[PDB]
Ligand binder design. Structure first.
Ligand SMILES: O=C(NCc1ccccc1)N1CCN(C(=O)c2ccco2)CC1
Length: 121
């Protein structure tokens, strides 16, 4: 299964699944900087699922590893903003992170396999 390009539609599909999850609600759009004026000083690099989808659709990811690094930043930014590990949003972030990691594993595996096959000879 050595299609070097197949990751992109696989990631579009997975982002669609994540937008259908009620658990993505708090991560679907950039955090409001006027609503959270201190957000700026806790979080250096904001990240949300609309930004990831638009970066993919612009052709500005070279690999699913780069998409995966931005999705992981959403979840790390939530673990950093959370004042409690028994909070609504941080709790939503941990379930969504598990769903994402369960689905991205095969995408990364298939891509890395396809690149090794391309450089086999
Ligand atoms: O307001 C946000 N995002 C816009 C939005 C949220 C809900 C509905 C529509 C739009 N947030 C998401 C990021 N964040 C946290 O991860 C977090 C951890 C502990 C408390 O919040 C702060 C809230």
């Amino acid at each position: 299964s050595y299609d070097i390009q197949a990751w992109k539609k696989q990631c579009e599909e997975l982002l669609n699944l994540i937008f259908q999850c009620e658990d993505s609600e708090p991560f679907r759009q950039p955090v409001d900087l006027l609503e959270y004026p201190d957000y700026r000083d806790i979080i250096d690099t904001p990240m949300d699922f609309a930004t990831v989808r638009e970066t993919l659709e612009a052709g500005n990811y070279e690999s699913p590893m780069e998409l995966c690094k931005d999705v992981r930043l959403i979840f790390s930014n939530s673990k950093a903003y959370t004042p409690s590990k028994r909070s609504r949003i941080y709790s939503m972030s941990l379930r969504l992170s598990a769903f994402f990691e369960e689905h991205i594993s095969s995408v990364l595996s298939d891509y890395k396999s396809a690149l090794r096959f391309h450089k086999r000879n």
